[PDB]
Structure formats: structure tokens, C-alpha cells
Design goal:
Elements lengths: L28 E2 L2 E5 L12 E10 L6 E5 L3 E5 L6 E9 L10 E3 L11
Antiparallel strand pairs: 1-2, 2-5, 3-4, 3-6, 6-7
PDB class: neuropeptide
Keywords: KIAA1496 protein, neuropeptide
Assembly: monomeric
Length: 117
């Protein structure tokens, strides 16, 4: 087909997100879960505050990443079944989603011999 572009004024509606991604996005692996943790995001004046975040977790590849609702600065996922895990934290507000932090790299379960003695 074809495409074009010109531009046309417009108006605004509803508040807007901070756009600031959650930092200190740390993770962990214990027992049989993934303890995720990341700082909080506070929107400036007018900006919409963060009421929650979206934990975007997907395999080293995956087709469509999934979203997990979390009304906190932490989260808990399931152990990675082979292939690295690309986790992305997104700060959502009353307006909608926000920005996605830095994809997390979680390597599968090591490959060592259990019961050593």
C-alpha cells in the first residue's frame, strides 16, 4: 500500500503517567519461586501516581510476554523452565501503564549433581 503524514493539532484528556521506570529492579530465586523487587515510582505534580506495576515476564524468547498484577514494589514468579527469563517492570497508574525498566536476565536452574555426600 502506501503511507503519508502531515500533522494536526489535538487536545489532551485524562491525566498522564510519570514515565519514570522502577529502579533498583532486583530479583532472586529461592525454594521454587522468584522474589522480585524494585524501587517505587512517584509522579510529580499533576502527574498520575503509581498505584501498581506490571511484571512482564517472558522466556529467553517467548511469543507474547505475560503481565502480572502487583499492588506493591515486589512480586513473585515461578522458577524459569529452561531458557533465560526476560522480566520487565512497568509502573501503571489511574491513566494506564508506564515505562518498562531494564529487562531482567534470570538464568535457568544450574546443572549440578545433587546430594554431594
Amino acid at each position: 500500500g502506501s503511507s503519508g503524514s502531515s500533522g494536526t493539532v489535538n487536545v489532551t484528556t485524562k491525566k498522564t503517567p510519570p514515565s519514570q521506570p522502577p529502579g533498583n529492579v532486583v530479583w532472586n530465586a529461592t525454594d521454587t519461586k522468584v522474589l522480585l523487587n524494585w524501587e517505587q515510582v512517584k509522579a510529580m505534580e499533576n502527574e498520575s501516581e503509581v498505584t501498581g506495576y506490571k511484571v512482564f515476564y517472558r522466556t529467553s524468547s517467548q511469543n507474547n510476554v505475560q503481565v502480572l498484577n502487583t499492588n506493591k514494589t515486589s512480586a513473585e514468579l515461578v522458577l524459569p523452565i529452561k531458557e533465560d527469563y526476560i522480566i520487565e517492570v512497568k509502573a501503571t497508574t489511574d491513566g494506564g501503564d508506564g515505562t518498562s525498566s531494564e529487562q531482567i536476565r534470570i538464568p535457568r536452574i544450574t546443572s549440578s549433581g545433587p546430594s554431594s555426600g
